[PDB]
Design a protein around this motif. Structure first.
Motif, PDB file in Angstrom:
ATOM      1  N   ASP A 184       0.809  -1.223   0.000  1.00  0.00           N
ATOM      2  CA  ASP A 184       0.000   0.000   0.000  1.00  0.00           C
ATOM      3  C   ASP A 184       0.843   1.275   0.000  1.00  0.00           C
ATOM      4  O   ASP A 184       0.573   2.200   0.776  1.00  0.00           O
ATOM      5  N   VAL A 185       1.856   1.343  -0.861  1.00  0.00           N
ATOM      6  CA  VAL A 185       2.761   2.492  -0.915  1.00  0.00           C
ATOM      7  C   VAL A 185       3.200   2.694  -2.364  1.00  0.00           C
ATOM      8  O   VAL A 185       3.607   1.741  -3.037  1.00  0.00           O
ATOM      9  N   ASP A 186       3.113   3.938  -2.842  1.00  0.00           N
ATOM     10  CA  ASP A 186       3.393   4.248  -4.242  1.00  0.00           C
ATOM     11  C   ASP A 186       4.864   4.000  -4.555  1.00  0.00           C
ATOM     12  O   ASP A 186       5.743   4.680  -4.018  1.00  0.00           O
ATOM     13  N   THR A 187       5.133   3.034  -5.436  1.00  0.00           N
ATOM     14  CA  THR A 187       6.508   2.765  -5.842  1.00  0.00           C
ATOM     15  C   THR A 187       7.089   3.876  -6.708  1.00  0.00           C
ATOM     16  O   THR A 187       8.313   3.947  -6.858  1.00  0.00           O
ATOM     17  N   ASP A 188       6.247   4.736  -7.282  1.00  0.00           N
ATOM     18  CA  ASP A 188       6.751   5.878  -8.035  1.00  0.00           C
ATOM     19  C   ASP A 188       7.526   6.809  -7.112  1.00  0.00           C
ATOM     20  O   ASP A 188       7.143   7.027  -5.959  1.00  0.00           O
ATOM     21  N   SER A 189       8.629   7.354  -7.631  1.00  0.00           N
ATOM     22  CA  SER A 189       9.574   8.173  -6.874  1.00  0.00           C
ATOM     23  C   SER A 189      10.103   7.411  -5.659  1.00  0.00           C
ATOM     24  O   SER A 189       9.807   7.780  -4.514  1.00  0.00           O
ATOM     25  N   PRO A 190      10.890   6.355  -5.859  1.00  0.00           N
ATOM     26  CA  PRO A 190      11.381   5.591  -4.702  1.00  0.00           C
ATOM     27  C   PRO A 190      12.292   6.380  -3.766  1.00  0.00           C
ATOM     28  O   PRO A 190      12.341   6.063  -2.568  1.00  0.00           O
ATOM     29  N   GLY A 217      17.127  -2.942  16.107  1.00  0.00           N
ATOM     30  CA  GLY A 217      15.859  -3.204  15.445  1.00  0.00           C
ATOM     31  C   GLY A 217      15.532  -2.206  14.349  1.00  0.00           C
ATOM     32  O   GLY A 217      14.950  -2.563  13.317  1.00  0.00           O
ATOM     33  N   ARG A 218      15.904  -0.942  14.546  1.00  0.00           N
ATOM     34  CA  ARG A 218      15.661   0.055  13.508  1.00  0.00           C
ATOM     35  C   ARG A 218      16.562  -0.166  12.299  1.00  0.00           C
ATOM     36  O   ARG A 218      16.135   0.027  11.156  1.00  0.00           O
ATOM     37  N   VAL A 219      17.812  -0.559  12.529  1.00  0.00           N
ATOM     38  CA  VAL A 219      18.700  -0.855  11.411  1.00  0.00           C
ATOM     39  C   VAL A 219      18.198  -2.082  10.651  1.00  0.00           C
ATOM     40  O   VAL A 219      18.216  -2.107   9.415  1.00  0.00           O
ATOM     41  N   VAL A 220      17.713  -3.100  11.371  1.00  0.00           N
ATOM     42  CA  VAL A 220      17.159  -4.281  10.710  1.00  0.00           C
ATOM     43  C   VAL A 220      15.938  -3.899   9.861  1.00  0.00           C
ATOM     44  O   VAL A 220      15.842  -4.274   8.687  1.00  0.00           O
ATOM     45  N   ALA A 221      15.024  -3.088  10.426  1.00  0.00           N
ATOM     46  CA  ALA A 221      13.862  -2.587   9.690  1.00  0.00           C
ATOM     47  C   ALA A 221      14.269  -1.861   8.414  1.00  0.00           C
ATOM     48  O   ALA A 221      13.661  -2.061   7.355  1.00  0.00           O
ATOM     49  N   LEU A 222      15.286  -1.001   8.502  1.00  0.00           N
ATOM     50  CA  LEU A 222      15.762  -0.238   7.349  1.00  0.00           C
ATOM     51  C   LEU A 222      16.244  -1.148   6.228  1.00  0.00           C
ATOM     52  O   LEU A 222      15.820  -1.009   5.073  1.00  0.00           O
ATOM     53  N   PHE A 223      17.161  -2.074   6.548  1.00  0.00           N
ATOM     54  CA  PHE A 223      17.652  -3.030   5.558  1.00  0.00           C
ATOM     55  C   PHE A 223      16.525  -3.868   4.982  1.00  0.00           C
ATOM     56  O   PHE A 223      16.510  -4.166   3.781  1.00  0.00           O
ATOM     57  N   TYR A 224      15.573  -4.264   5.821  1.00  0.00           N
ATOM     58  CA  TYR A 224      14.464  -5.055   5.308  1.00  0.00           C
ATOM     59  C   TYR A 224      13.622  -4.235   4.350  1.00  0.00           C
ATOM     60  O   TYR A 224      13.258  -4.704   3.260  1.00  0.00           O
ATOM     61  N   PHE A 225      13.323  -2.996   4.731  1.00  0.00           N
ATOM     62  CA  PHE A 225      12.505  -2.159   3.868  1.00  0.00           C
ATOM     63  C   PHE A 225      13.208  -1.899   2.539  1.00  0.00           C
ATOM     64  O   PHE A 225      12.591  -2.024   1.476  1.00  0.00           O
ATOM     65  N   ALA A 226      14.511  -1.588   2.572  1.00  0.00           N
ATOM     66  CA  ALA A 226      15.259  -1.456   1.320  1.00  0.00           C
ATOM     67  C   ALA A 226      15.076  -2.680   0.413  1.00  0.00           C
ATOM     68  O   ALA A 226      14.785  -2.546  -0.780  1.00  0.00           O
ATOM     69  N   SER A 227      15.231  -3.890   0.960  1.00  0.00           N
ATOM     70  CA  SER A 227      15.131  -5.070   0.102  1.00  0.00           C
ATOM     71  C   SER A 227      13.721  -5.240  -0.443  1.00  0.00           C
ATOM     72  O   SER A 227      13.552  -5.711  -1.567  1.00  0.00           O
ATOM     73  N   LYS A 228      12.701  -4.823   0.313  1.00  0.00           N
ATOM     74  CA  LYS A 228      11.339  -4.854  -0.209  1.00  0.00           C
ATOM     75  C   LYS A 228      11.120  -3.822  -1.306  1.00  0.00           C
ATOM     76  O   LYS A 228      10.281  -4.035  -2.187  1.00  0.00           O
ATOM     77  N   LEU A 229      11.800  -2.672  -1.234  1.00  0.00           N
ATOM     78  CA  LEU A 229      11.684  -1.693  -2.311  1.00  0.00           C
ATOM     79  C   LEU A 229      12.268  -2.230  -3.611  1.00  0.00           C
ATOM     80  O   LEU A 229      11.794  -1.880  -4.701  1.00  0.00           O
ATOM     81  N   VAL A 230      13.297  -3.072  -3.521  1.00  0.00           N
ATOM     82  CA  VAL A 230      13.847  -3.674  -4.729  1.00  0.00           C
ATOM     83  C   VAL A 230      12.780  -4.489  -5.448  1.00  0.00           C
ATOM     84  O   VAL A 230      12.622  -4.391  -6.669  1.00  0.00           O
ATOM     85  N   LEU A 231      12.014  -5.288  -4.704  1.00  0.00           N
ATOM     86  CA  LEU A 231      10.934  -6.037  -5.340  1.00  0.00           C
ATOM     87  C   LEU A 231       9.825  -5.107  -5.818  1.00  0.00           C
ATOM     88  O   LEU A 231       9.325  -5.255  -6.936  1.00  0.00           O
ATOM     89  N   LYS A 232       9.446  -4.121  -5.002  1.00  0.00           N
ATOM     90  CA  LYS A 232       8.316  -3.267  -5.356  1.00  0.00           C
ATOM     91  C   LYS A 232       8.534  -2.485  -6.649  1.00  0.00           C
ATOM     92  O   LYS A 232       7.570  -1.916  -7.175  1.00  0.00           O
ATOM     93  N   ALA A 233       9.755  -2.455  -7.192  1.00  0.00           N
ATOM     94  CA  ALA A 233      10.010  -1.785  -8.460  1.00  0.00           C
ATOM     95  C   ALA A 233      10.548  -2.701  -9.548  1.00  0.00           C
ATOM     96  O   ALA A 233      10.502  -2.321 -10.725  1.00  0.00           O
ATOM     97  N   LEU A 234      11.056  -3.880  -9.203  1.00  0.00           N
ATOM     98  CA  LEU A 234      11.558  -4.812 -10.211  1.00  0.00           C
ATOM     99  C   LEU A 234      10.597  -5.973 -10.423  1.00  0.00           C
ATOM    100  O   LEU A 234      11.026  -7.104 -10.643  1.00  0.00           O
TER     101      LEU A 234
END
Length: 156
Positions: free
Chosen positions: A53-59, A79-96
């Protein structure tokens, strides 16, 4: 170990190693413990719903304000660093390919600009192994999911 050169190099491998999953002995233990937390996070349907539920446009916009939100109090925890790395890897899928390099670049930029001094104060990435070295360390998933959920809300 606490040198910024090593912290950026190691961060790069842990992130590259991470993203390649969603797609020496101490560092293997980190890779594997991140993997496991990732696997569990991937089973959280509320969390996956929000990430969808987040616009992949303009990552670049969404990545950086999400990351800044998780760290807006000027404090640090693994935990915040883990969240950050996890979110980054999800952005890779959300655009590829180059998407991987770009998002890793944004993430590496945030780590250097904001997380470097804190990770030095932890003894380096070895600190993250301390964060993982408890009984029921897998319930860290609940905490990382919480951090991610709060940060997608403001955006949503």
């Amino acid at each position: 170990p606490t040198s910024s050169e090593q912290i950026m190099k190691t961060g790069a491998f842990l992130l590259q190693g991470f993203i390649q999953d969603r797609a020496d002995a101490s560092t293997k233990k980190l890779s594997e413990s991140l993997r496991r937390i990732g696997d569990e996070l991937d089973s959280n349907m509320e969390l996956q719903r929000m990430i969808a539920d987040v616009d992949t446009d303009s990552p670049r916009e969404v990545f950086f304000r999400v990351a800044a939100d998780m760290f807006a109090d000027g404090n640090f925890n693994w935990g915040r660093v883990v969240a950050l790395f996890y979110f980054a890897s999800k952005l890779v899928l959300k655009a590829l390919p180059e998407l991987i390099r770009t998002i890793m670049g944004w993430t590496l930029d945030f780590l250097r600009e904001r997380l470097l001094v804190w990770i030095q104060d932890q003894g380096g990435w070895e600190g993250l192994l301390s964060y993982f070295g408890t009984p029921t360390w897998q319930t860290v998933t609940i905490f990382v999911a919480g951090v991610l959920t709060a940060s997608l809300t403001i955006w949503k």
